[PDB]
């Protein structure tokens, strides 16, 4: 069945990544994550910011580059 014919989830994810990455550093850090949390205005308790980064790869990168963010998004590949 046809749904998304476009490729531009990569564009979405890239421009989303840049809305976290203020620093233009190529990483979403904990700080960038919490800076996003206070931009939405959601009163998160630091530990779930830690969970979100810990989820998005302490195995290889440590904090979150675009491939880790792509991995965290592509986790929903019908899931």
């Amino acid at each position: 069945t046809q749904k998304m014919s476009e490729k531009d989830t990569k564009e979405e994810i890239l421009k989303a990544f840049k809305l976290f990455d203020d620093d233009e550093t190529g990483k979403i850090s904990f700080k960038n994550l919490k800076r996003v949390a206070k931009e939405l205005g959601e009163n998160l308790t630091d530990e779930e910011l830690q969970e979100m980064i810990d989820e998005a790869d302490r195995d290889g990168d440590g904090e979150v580059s675009e491939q880790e963010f792509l991995r965290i998004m592509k986790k929903t590949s019908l899931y």
């Binding site: 989303a16 809305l19 976290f20 949390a37 931009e39 939405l40 779930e48 979100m52 965290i72 998004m73």
Partner: peptide
Amino acid sequence: RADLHHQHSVLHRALQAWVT
């Protein structure tokens, strides 16, 4: 649900898809 007048919101889509 980010339907009418997309001034901002859609950082929510990125953040909330990660946390929730």
